A = this chain, B = another copy of it.
Amino acid sequence: TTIVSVRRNGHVVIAGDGQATLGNTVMKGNVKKVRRLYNDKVIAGFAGGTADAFTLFELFERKLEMHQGHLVKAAVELAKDWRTDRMLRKLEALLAVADETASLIITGNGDVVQPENDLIAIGSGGPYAQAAARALLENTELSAREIAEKALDIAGDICIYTNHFHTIEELSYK
């Protein structure tokens, strides 16, 4: 899988492929790995269980309700329980989350990470996406969406665990 997030000119996105793999074969080819949260204000993508998601995202929404849209805080509060609550402790995943404010990664370890330029590239294809995104972002006037898209393709092209089905979720603000 490959989750790519990019932010340029009051535009932030999160794009992902749709391949789920079991051993050396493809189980499914159209997995939705990028959703939307907090009354379609907060976008997010992820790598993991379809339920872990539907549990980690629902909660995240509440943390946002308990911290007036302040992305970061809810995020900080999220990774908190996620590494503490006996039960929650078992869900494994990598949430990519971004709002007009900022974007970042949360990990079962409870970490909250803000990458160099709100550039996120998680998953087995993460680095190939990062490499292509970084390239584009530094040598062309392309858009945040055009980036993630193209970056994602490059990835699915290199990564044996990443395909070409996409699920993009933008966000305009300026």
* Interface residues in chain A, defined as those with a beta carbon under 8 Å from any beta carbon in chain B: 20, 25, 27-31, 49-52, 54-55, 76, 79-80, 83-84, 87, 89-92, 105, 109-116, 127
Contacts and interface: CB of A to CB of B under 8 A. Distances in A.
A115 B51 contact: no
A109 B52 contact: yes
A110 B76 contact: no
A48 B27 CA distance: 18
Could you tell me the dominant secondary structure of chain A's interface residues? mixed
A29 B134 CA distance: 14
Given A25-B127, A27-B105, A50-B113, 20 more contacts: A27-B113, A28-B113, A28-B114, A28-B115, A28-B116, A30-B116, A31-B113, A49-B109, A49-B110, A51-B76, A51-B79, A51-B109, A52-B83, A52-B109, A52-B110, A52-B111, A83-B90, A83-B91, A89-B90, A92-B109
Contacts of A110: 49-52, 55, 91
B79 A90 contact: no
Contact of A84 (B27, B28, B76, B87): B87
Given A30-B116, A116-B29, A127-B25, A111 B55 contact: no
